[PDB]
Amino acid sequence: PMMQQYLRLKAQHPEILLFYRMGDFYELFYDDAKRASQLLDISLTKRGASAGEPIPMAGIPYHAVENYLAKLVNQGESVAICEKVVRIVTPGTISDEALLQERQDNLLAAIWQDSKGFGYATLDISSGRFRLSEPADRETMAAELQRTNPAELLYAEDFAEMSLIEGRRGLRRRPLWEFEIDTARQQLNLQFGTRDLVGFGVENAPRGLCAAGCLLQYAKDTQRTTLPHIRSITMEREQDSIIMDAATRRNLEITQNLAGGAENTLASVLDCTVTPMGSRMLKRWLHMPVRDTRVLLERQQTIGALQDFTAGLQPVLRQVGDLERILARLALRTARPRDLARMRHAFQQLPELRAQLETVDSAPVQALREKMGEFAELRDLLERAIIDTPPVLVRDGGVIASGYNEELDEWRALADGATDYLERLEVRERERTGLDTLKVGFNAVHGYYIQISRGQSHLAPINYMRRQTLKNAERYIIPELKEYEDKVLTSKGKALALEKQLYEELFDLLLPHLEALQQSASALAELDVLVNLAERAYTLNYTCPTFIDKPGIRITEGRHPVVEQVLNEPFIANPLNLSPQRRMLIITGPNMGGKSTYMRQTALIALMAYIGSYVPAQKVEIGPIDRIFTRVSTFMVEMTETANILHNATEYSLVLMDEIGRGTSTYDGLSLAWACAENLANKIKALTLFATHYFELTQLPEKMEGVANVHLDALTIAFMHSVQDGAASKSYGLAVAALAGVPKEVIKRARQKLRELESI
Template sequence: MKGTGTPAAMAECEDELTPMMSQYFELCAEYDSAMVLFQVGDFYETFCEAAERCARLLEITLTSREDSTGEYPMAGIPIDNATSYVETLLDAGYRVAIADQIEDPSEASGVVERAVTRVITPGTVLDDALLGADNNYLACVGADEEESLAVAFLDLSTGSFRVASGTERVIQDELDRQQPTELLIDPPLEGTISTDCTETIDDSISFESDAAKQRVGAYVPSPEAVFETTAELIACGALLAYAEYTQGVSPGGLASVTRISRYAPTETMGLSGTTIESLELFENQHGDDDHTLLAVLDETTTAMGRRTLADWLRRPLCDASAIQCRLDAVETLVATPLVRETLRELLADAYDLERLIARVADDRANARDCRSLQATLEILPAVAGALDTIDCQPLADRRDALPALDGVCERIDAAIQHDPPIELTDGGIITDGYDEQLDSLRSTQREGEQWINELEATERDRTGIDSLKVGYNEVHGYYIEVTNPNLDAVPEEYTRRQTLKNAERFYTPALKDREDAILGASERATELEYQLFCELRADVGDHTDRIQQAATVLAELDVLTTLATVATRRDYVRPAFDGTGSNGAIEIEGGRHPVVETTQPLFVPNDTTLCDERIAIITGPNMSGKSTYMRQIALIQIMAQLGSFVPADRARLPIVDRVFTRVGASDDIAGGQSTFMREMSELSTILHSATPSSLVILDEVGRGTATTDGRAIARATTEFLHDEIGALTLFATHYHELTELADELAAVTNVHFTVDRDGEELTFLHTVLDGAASGSYGVAVARLAGVPDPVIDRVESLHDEDTDANQTATSTTETDDSIDSTTTIDDSSSDTIETHVGDRSLRETIAELSIADTTPLEALQTLYELQRRIDTTNGPPTGRENGRSHRSG
């Protein structure tokens, strides 16, 4: 992350610095990787080079400060409106160090003491105005001496903390699907992980195992019982050290962190960043969250429920019993609408309990936060009562997991005013009757104020001055005001306090005594209120773990009632499961795309069957619905494994370990990848990582290069998926030659999208039928899109010429084949074969291939080279010389 450029600034400005400027540059040197915002009165100021940067970036006025040592560039922002400016700095890649005045300027004997109270980074923000509704994860990747890797995720706003280990590919996938806002990396690992978030490579954070064990030990009694690898311990320790540094707390000082959960990525469905993006789970192609799967499913009533739903969507389950438990709960709530609506009404009154208790635990909560927390805890008995009325073990388990927190509610209700002020130091927070000393001070204050309220009438009667007034201001305190024409009537015991243009202000010994009593009581009462509130907040914080447990239960109930609500409104059905992906089948009747059906009034449902035939080649014209069809199957699979009902008339599904997608066409210019290179990289990942239990979605693989190359890549990919992997696969293509594989490979089938053609008019029926499409109707689609008629005419002319040429070539090939069929080839004579092929080294090349050590991408390249050599010697390939002449399956 960016710093302030402190060395250059100091070289420019530190000749003979004043004490305040020395203080500023000392803090800049200590926090050299951050932009230091230095409190001066009601503003946060920056100076010299940092000021020039802030002025440009924040679009604020660049002024100057002049003192005995010179003139310095200066730019500042108002403290009361600092949040938006801090957000701009974070977006620009800066850390922000807040240097607050920690001493009352009126009591300072010299320069006011200042200290950095917190460092704000993208992954450690806690201000509600900077936090979105979703989790805000700070992540850390660490490695141990055995070079095993681990990644830890911490959301400081909720206390959620989890860690996992795995290969570099696994760690990359976890980062892609959790999408942290900031990533802390051990410097030796720089460049091994690629993310879109802010990356912090900090040599000052210890990635040593001993330091990590000591750090983690402050939060977890027995670290060795939590972690399976030293890398996990290191990742958690470094992350905690960085979080403590940014929050300005000592080791163990993150009170909202009460547990560290270890998880195995294999326990959940693998979803890479490419899959999440192409299936538009959280963002659509325009970069917003409209028309996404999350948007369709999100009927949650609480912020914590929404975060939990997003987490379930990022990590669908792979354990059959866990999936069935969620589905049992959803089915019960579908069947009991009264209970479902009762729960939703109760949860609608719940505040964000996860973030509230985190603020309480970390001493950031105000009185209104405590009241919101109490209001949420008060619904727990009613929630438990609603669940008592139904017979469903997963829901009963959640009811039983709700902790009894009546004592916490009663304590807050007894202590905090019903509508307390936001500020904690202005009084008015604690209720009457809560504390005897406070009641006494308030009584003294009220009695004094009553005496003063009566003083004005008493003094008017006593002095005969009808214009006499009693008032108060913060500078001079209480006073008796007499206008100039009546000064002769002022009693001798009045002492002048202030002279005005038209009046004089006085006080009396009795008034001064009452003032001292009132102000003393008020000041002591305010101080006591703050003390009592802090004690209450600490007592509530002692229940952090149990309140976090309650928050988890409420969030899950919110998600389950939401899934039941969506299922009811959108006519979803409960899916059944048929083993794992390696031996299960996909059988969907009347399947629908959950997002597209919400935007299209007439959506055509379709069936899907992948059983013994595990690869479906899908053909049909553009715009017919191939991509939508494949995506809807992937989305139905994901929804089912997260525990949701699905958009279909009936669905029987396997449990898949991963969903892979290779769809769309886009380049990565900054990363140095063309569209085709990116396509091949994604394909390579699939062919290396897919298993028989995976679901693979391929859309137009091989279209980014020459037709001959692309067709060969598409065919070889299909054969590899069939022969070597065995994954359930949907492959949409315009290479109609691939449909021949259904006759050659036992587990390949053809399906196509139907079109109704009347002359030059096309009607897309969006219906899937068995068999291969008769064509792609490219010219008709071009005409439908409005391509000018002269272009269409020329296309048809060129198409006719190509057809004639192909027929001629076919005729010639048949003649050559008849000659070849009469040629006697002696199997014992390799010379005859080599002469026929025209390349005597071809057999040696094939014989020398090390199949076991060849990657899928290398195999495709080798196939291309061999094909090119055959084409060069024998002319254009004919018939099935492009591939294999026969496959027994």
């Protein structure tokens, strides 16, 4: 009967480690101890046993286990905690603030492999944000697993390309019944309360519904709740956003710099959001730029309309905090008293924001104002039910405010030491009995009593039950008074238990508003983003981009939004004109000329325009952009990226290609660079910026339509960082080499070779 209370629910998911209650020290057994002690080096022990075969043990002490949660969970392992197992922690299902990262989303994902493609579904437990997609090929699944980057990945038993999910943290093998399409529909439809999955536009996508269905059960089974925050699933269409492979996200340093850090990136410049849920939304937008023109226009309107009012809106938005992750704990019933105190504090800012946005003459602003609600009755409820600054946990007490419930206020008075009933009883009894010496008292000896002095004692009524005889007086008890003592002795207990019950009641009172509450969390997150982008555009001097109906980019005095911030010396803004009549530019000129910076700034201004933000330029006109491609074992990996561009670019794609042809012979390289420039020019007809050192490619504009020459000017070598019309005058390879420090005689002799080379 000892061991039979921990394996009760472990039989369902056997990979889960269990911190068992044993001698006020969280322990483990049956090879769970082997890992706990394997990747942590902690004390491997044995427990007393005489059944004929040995018992394995490995432990840790109480209030010295929270640091072992985050370590094992960030490692990729799951942890259950027996007390009853009142907590299961899995890498993709963490709802607690301490384990999560404030400005990074955390995902649970499930992958599937059908006889016509894959099934991929993702969920954030702390948002309720549920997505699904149908990648038909390995290369797209690779790009999806790299972008979503789940902390916990569910895969079927029969999964075929386990190479895609090899060497991954938080991996989970699952039986085929979890993925069954018929039951997945039943599960999902009922989770969203629907007859068909149309309206979410996922009904006709069965590969992804399997992965959705498996995941939904794995979330329910580990979080043991209704999961009310998960009310919808959404397919992400490629046409709906700007496609970018993992290479482009890396070369454009969107949220991560080339060295792994976060410093000196597009997000480090634009992300000045005042809430964690805002920061998270902004980073999401940067990685998924929208192709919807109206969403983008409503986004610019909010930026322009709220620019003057940032100073008043941001300190208020700061006070809202991460309502999103607070509501997730309300949905999972895990919400601590401080979560509810902070939710009230967020609610106390909605009148301010509503009053502030009231006169803003903008339909999308007025739309955010409505969506963010006010929740007048819910604010009042939390003001009345919780104390101003409550404790971290419920159990000790002191959470429920005085005045919310009279029985609590009553119970608390007996626990504090209120003697009002005793004063009332005393007057009643004295007047009732007509004995002036009658007094109500208490001693450890006989408890609560009615004392009558010897001289009146013999006239004590027949209902008085004597307990003590002193020389001066006698002391009695009555049913009424016995009943009061019992209440006084159970006071703290009853009050502590009632607090707990009234605390639960609040969840019941709050949850039927979760939908409206989730829209408010979203409205306020988004508000913080566009108010951030409003302030950024003013401070970092940005203009509103213009949308045109054909492939093309027209940038006037454009800048690199990160380089301009990093540099001490001023940024030299440059123009660009890409149109259906001028599609490809052969960018020539010296090293440190500004070729890379010019190409990347084009991709970032394009990206920013496609997040609804104002851009770093005097003026921008941009057409549809379906994809941003950068090509900016060396030759082999450059050609792999090149083949990706040639196989997937369209007339709506932006192609940035730097020095293609390097890493091979001059002839082979030139041949290859020419072939590629030719293909992207006359066959693909993408918006190409093609940086080269082969001055032979400068003959292409003379040879074909849509191609033209530009160069980075350099002046005895001074880099001017200005893009000019025409092919570059000469080669500064020897001058740059001289500046890098290459010996005089080495440069002098290389100049002699140069004479001989151009003299043949």
